[PDB]
Amino acid sequence: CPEEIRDQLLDFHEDLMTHCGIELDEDGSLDGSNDLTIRGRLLDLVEKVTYLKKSSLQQLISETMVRWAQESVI
Amino acid sequence: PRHRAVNLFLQGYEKSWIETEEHYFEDKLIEDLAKPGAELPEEDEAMKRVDPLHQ
């Protein structure tokens, strides 16, 4: 007897899309959140990267670059 | 901890989800600041500068 006798082997034939791809298909199967207890942490870190951090350096660089390009033709 | 496909997954997520918002946001502000108008030429010349975008 197998692990599960639901239909053939497992729930919704986990072997079919588990053995077909592990390095790529398994990682691509995580289409979004509401899958495990780490999706919230992953979303939090993704939002944590995108604060446009530098932000003072980036805004000062943009300001001084506009000032350089605006005073006269170069 | 010996496979790097998680980095590729994060790269795909970055180019998929946040890239659209970044493209929708970054294109406007640069064009708004193309002509701030804060620095007057203060010169007695008729050269009549318009924008650095002309340059």
Experimental structure resolution, Å: 3.5
Token pair for residue A30?
């995580």
Tokens 């001084």, located at residue: A64
- Note whether B18 contacts A46, CB cutoff 8 Å: yes
Q: What are the distances in angstroms from CA B48 to CA A41, A70, B38, B51?
A: 55, 13, 15, 10
Q: Pick the closest to residue A52 from B21, B33, B16, B7 (CA basis).
A: B21
Q: How far is A28 from chain B (nearest CA, A)?
A: 7
Tokens standing for residue B51 = 């924008």
Residue A40 · residue A28 · CB < 8 Å: no
Sign of CA dihedral A52, A58, A60, A65: negative
Taking an 8 Å cut-off on Cβ atoms, the answer to whether A69 and B52 are in contact is yes
Indicate the Cα dihedral angle B24, B30, B36, B40, nearest 10°. Answer: -170
User: Does any CB of chain B come closer than 8 Å to the CB of residue A47?
Assistant: no
Q: Does B55 touch chain A (CB under 8 A)?
A: yes
Contact A46, B18 (CB under 8 A): yes
How many CB atoms within 10 Å of residue A70? Answer: 19
Instruction: Name the minimum distance, in Å, from the CA of B49 to any CA of chain A.
Output: 9
**Which residues on chain A are in Cβ contact (under 8 Å) with B3?**
23
Which residues in chain B are contacts of A28 at CB distance < 8 A? 9, 12
How many angstroms separate the CA atoms of A35 and B6, rounded? 16
Alpha helices by DSSP H, listed for chain A, are 14-19, 25-28, 39-49, 56-71
CB atoms within 10 A of CB B54: 8
A30 inside 8 A of chain B by CB: yes
Per-residue burial over A27-56, b = 16 or more CB atoms within 10 Å of its CB, e = otherwise: beeeeeeeeeeeeeebeeeeeeeeeeeeee
